Amino acid sequence: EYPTVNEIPVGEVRLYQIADGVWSHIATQSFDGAVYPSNGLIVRDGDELLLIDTAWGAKNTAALLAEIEKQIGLPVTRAVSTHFHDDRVGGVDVLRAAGVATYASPSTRRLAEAEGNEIPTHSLEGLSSSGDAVRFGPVELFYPGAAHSTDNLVVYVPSANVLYGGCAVLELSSTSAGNVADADLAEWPTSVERIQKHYPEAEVVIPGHGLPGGLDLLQHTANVVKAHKN
Numbered sequence: 001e002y003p004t005v006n007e008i009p010v011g012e013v014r015l016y017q018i019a020d021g022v023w024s025h026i027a028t029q030s031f032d033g034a035v036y037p038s039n040g041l042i043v044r045d046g047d048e049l050l051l052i053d054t055a056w057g058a059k060n061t062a063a064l065l066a067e068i069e070k071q072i073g074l075p076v077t078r079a080v081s082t083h084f085h086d087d088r089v090g091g092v093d094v095l096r097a098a099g100v101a102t103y104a105s106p107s108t109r110r111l112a113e114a115e116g117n118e119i120p121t122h123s124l125e126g127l128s129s130s131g132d133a134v135r136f137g138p139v140e141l142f143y144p145g146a147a148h149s150t151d152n153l154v155v156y157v158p159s160a161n162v163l164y165g166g167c168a169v170l171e172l173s174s175t176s177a178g179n180v181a182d183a184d185l186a187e188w189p190t191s192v193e194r195i196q197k198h199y200p201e202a203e204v205v206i207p208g209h210g211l212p213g214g215l216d217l218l219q220h221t222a223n224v225v226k227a228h229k230n
């Protein structure tokens with residue numbers, strides 16, 4: 001079953017199979033003293049893998065690559081970071097040094113640079129406006145509008161009907177929107193509505209932190225964020 005913070009010591013990574021050729025990766029990291037789990041995604045594309053998000057730091061990301069080689073045995077050739085925070089880009093230097101081509105939107109790259117985070121090598125164009133969608137290997141990348149951050153992207157895997165929301169989507173047990181220092185609380189519910197409208201057929205929704213669920217994670221996120229904003 002789906003691993004939680006208690007089952008993953010900081011520095012270890014678990015993989016969880018979501019569908020044929022689709023896995024989440026789960027890592028843990030200390031932030032402001034406390035340990036949190038974090039998810040990303042792995043998608044098979046023929047005999048190579050596309051990585052979505054780092055495992056939140058260099059050591060975790062090196063462990064991620066090791067766990068991928070052990071469990072899956074296919075090379076990660078490209079990676080996309082879904083926003084500029086450390087749980088998404090921390091580890092990019094490890095990926096790049098391992099031969100993985102790293103990508104993010106221009107906005108994410110600029111914000112990462114400004115924050116002193118690692119910076120993905122390549123820009124993902126065509127994602128500047130809310131509702132924009134582009135194909136990238138076996139996934140579609142979608143910019144729903146500002147939410148957890150202004151740059152946040154979501155990822156859909158058409159072959160599996162799996163929607164990876166990153167931090168624009170919250171898990172069902174969540175009662176608050178979490179770290180909102182960079183968030184746009186006024187726009188976030190609208191951004192979620194765009195996701196709902198564009199991916200009504202999604203069967204699994206994976207949040208950036210915590211348990212995957214169904215489409216209800218989307219409405220739940222809008223609700224929490226509205227209640228948070230008050």
Ligand code: NA
Binds near residue numbers: 065077
């Ligand atoms: Na690899």
Ligand SMILES: [Zn+2]
Binds near residue numbers: 083085148167
């Ligand atoms: Zn974030």
Ligand SMILES: [Zn+2]
Binds near residue numbers: 209
């Ligand atoms: Zn986060």
